[PDB]
Amino acid sequence: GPYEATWESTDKHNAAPEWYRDAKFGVYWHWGAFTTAQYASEWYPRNMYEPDSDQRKHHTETYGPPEEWGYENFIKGAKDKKGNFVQFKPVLKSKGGEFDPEAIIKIVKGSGARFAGPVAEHHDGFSMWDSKVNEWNPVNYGPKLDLVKLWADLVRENDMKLVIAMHQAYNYNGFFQWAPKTNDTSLQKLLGQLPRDEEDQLWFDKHREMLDHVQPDIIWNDFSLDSPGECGSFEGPCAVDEQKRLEFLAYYFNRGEEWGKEVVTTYKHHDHGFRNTSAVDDWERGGPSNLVRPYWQTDDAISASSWSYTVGIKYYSSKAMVHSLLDRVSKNGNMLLNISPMANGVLPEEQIKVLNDIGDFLSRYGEAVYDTRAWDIYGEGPNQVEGGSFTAPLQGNSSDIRFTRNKEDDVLYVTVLGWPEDNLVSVKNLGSNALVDLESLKSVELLGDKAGDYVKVSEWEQSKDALDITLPSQPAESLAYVLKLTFDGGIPVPQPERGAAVFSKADATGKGVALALGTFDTVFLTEAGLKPEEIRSIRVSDGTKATLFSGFRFTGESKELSAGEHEVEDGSVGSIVVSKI
Ligand SMILES: *[C@@H]1O[C@H](CO)[C@@H](O[C@@H]2O[C@H](CO)[C@@H](O[C@@H]3O[C@H](CO[C@H]4O[C@H](CO)[C@@H](O)[C@H](O)[C@@H]4O)[C@@H](O)[C@H](O[C@H]4O[C@H](CO)[C@@H](O)[C@H](O)[C@@H]4O[C@H]4O[C@H](CO)[C@@H](O)[C@H](O)[C@@H]4O[C@H]4O[C@H](CO)[C@@H](O)[C@H](O)[C@@H]4O)[C@@H]3O)[C@H](O)[C@H]2NC(C)=O)[C@H](O)[C@H]1NC(C)=O
Ligand SMILES: *[C@@H]1O[C@H](CO)[C@@H](O[C@@H]2O[C@H](CO)[C@@H](O[C@@H]3O[C@H](CO)[C@@H](O)[C@H](O[C@H]4O[C@H](CO)[C@@H](O)[C@H](O)[C@@H]4O[C@H]4O[C@H](CO)[C@@H](O)[C@H](O)[C@@H]4O[C@H]4O[C@H](CO)[C@@H](O)[C@H](O)[C@@H]4O)[C@@H]3O)[C@H](O)[C@H]2NC(C)=O)[C@H](O)[C@H]1NC(C)=O
């Protein structure tokens, strides 16, 4: 194939193809041998060995000391302290058991997911496909089923793109740091104790074997690709050999070409192991606080506990999941939602209800979500995401709106996160203070009870503070409500209260991009719809300054501009920093 194992060659791969930007919402599942204990989290295989931990205490009381009853017993099977046989061994419904993967995939399809699939290998060394390179798999042991192939075939039967999640780097970069050393070479493979050159090779061989086996549309990767300092107390680079990373990228991108498919690979945002030229950044739970470019994704979970089922697990609400989805999509990302089947393969009814409720929302209001793109401002209102460390998912109300727009850039969707009891939606960024001319606003419509229904909004006025929209009669109840604003000849470019707007003509007209406070490089401005070489004017808000740089990313000659309108020489700007005075 045309890709070579170098950064410069692999950079040419299109990171986020149009189908992936259109998709918005996917579902995956942390289900595996790490679920067997149904205790604490999916990190149980690591923590069962940790000195003085709650997980070790539980393990020791339930099974035996971890030095005698090691993690490998969950895969190969053993008796617990009360003489019960314990093993990861889901039994198909068609064989009289409780594991019904077809039913689960129908539920996932019904949720509105446009991509779906399993965690194929987490950090615990167990590959869930029929693997020649790793004997630690569910065909050799346990259920005698190729779980990954079963899931993949069902996902394709149900007309969703296939995502496969792979977390196999941390396996040998510290996950099993507390497991006893072993001279059993097979057990060393499970526990990440092989020589590092062999482990680096195995990281690649696992990816290669899996991706040739199921032809994934997306390969999702966890951390420890090159994330020094993120592997706790283990002495090591918290990384995969660079050559092996590059060989993976070239192999997968070449296979995509061979298959006639536009493929995607994701990696954790903070990790340095891949580049954002060719791989999609996957933000920590909650996502970014701001609108980020280029296109990115984040993962979330129904569970309010761990990623994998545990006894006593608590869940978040349908509302939180839907509001979270709208938030991520408005900020130029996708949301990949995790679900948590029990060790036996049963999906709990509380999770089914959440998925059903997301699906009801998307079936009805999908026009505002699928196939849309972010505006230049993600939303308005008091309820926001902080970023950094996740506490609880976003839940908004009638005070909050999130924006999305169509590909033609003449329809703005204004999604309000509750029904306003005052029957008013006020859009600050379309008010007169926003320097927005609404002469071109042709229609304002409320999306109705079923997709394709529109109820006209008759009354609206533009104050200084906002476009003030009076709602018609409330439609059937929903978790959020959608207004559709159609403009002749393109959505107006708002002026942020503190921020700037850049334009393709010299007089603050033409194509434009609104900018908040922050830093905006050539990639940002280009993706937002205005290559910086084409900027010919800028309007800087009161209380704000803008610093223009000639370089791609805040290097080269710079010029500071205060509040007002300013002409800009063609080809003079590469990047911009917008700051509060
Ligand atoms: C995709 O991946 C790529 C690759 O990993 C990511 O690219 C990296 O992006 C980084 C963030 O933009 C970028 O880092 C910036 O580099 C600038 C240039 O550095 C080079 O030149 C300078 C000057 O010679 C050298 O000193 C330097 O060592 C480099 O060789 C730096 O200038 C940037 O530093 C400034 O910003 C950071 C915040 O990112 C501050 O912590 C820092 O103190 C600096 O702060 C000033 O400037 C920023 C403007 O960026 C202002 O916001 C801030 O208020 C400070 O303002 C003072 O100074 C400015 C003049 O600089 C003045 O106008 C102002 O009034 C103030 O006096 C920063 O370090 C990496 O270089 C880049 N890497 C590569 C390989 O490209 C990319 O981000 C990824 N994409 C996404 C979406 O994540
Ligand atoms: C005090 O403050 C100062 C100033 O902030 C701090 O200095 C900074 O310290 C950084 C850490 O040392 C230093 O970054 C390093 O810079 C070198 C030179 O550019 C760079 O090579 C380093 O990158 C390697 O190492 C990191 C950390 O593990 C990896 O994430 C990264 O992938 C690189 O790994 C490659 O090189 C390693 C050997 O160094 C190999 O072991 C590794 O396998 C890997 O090799 C592969 O990749 C190579 C290409 O990357 C390839 O050639 C090779 O063949 C293999 O394929 C790292 O970024 C900053 O430069 C430095 N800043 C300044 C201004 O000095 C200082 O740390 C502070 N002190 C304290 C106590 O905190």
Ligand SMILES: *[C@@H]1O[C@H](CO)[C@@H](O)[C@H](O)[C@H]1NC(C)=O
């Ligand atoms: C494992 O093999 C090494 C090398 O022969 C040996 O030193 C060590 O004692 C062995 N481990 C055990 C538990 O016997």
Ligand SMILES: *[C@@H]1O[C@H](CO)[C@@H](O)[C@H](O)[C@H]1NC(C)=O
């Ligand atoms: C919506 O949430 C905001 C922020 O917590 C709050 O100030 C406002 O009163 C809420 N509105 C309603 C109707 O509860």
Ligand SMILES: C[C@@H]1O[C@H](O)[C@@H](O)[C@H](O)[C@@H]1O
């Ligand atoms: C999605 C989460 O990513 C983290 O890096 C992992 O360590 C967790 O177990 C989980 O898979």
Ligand code: NA
């Ligand atoms: Na690219």
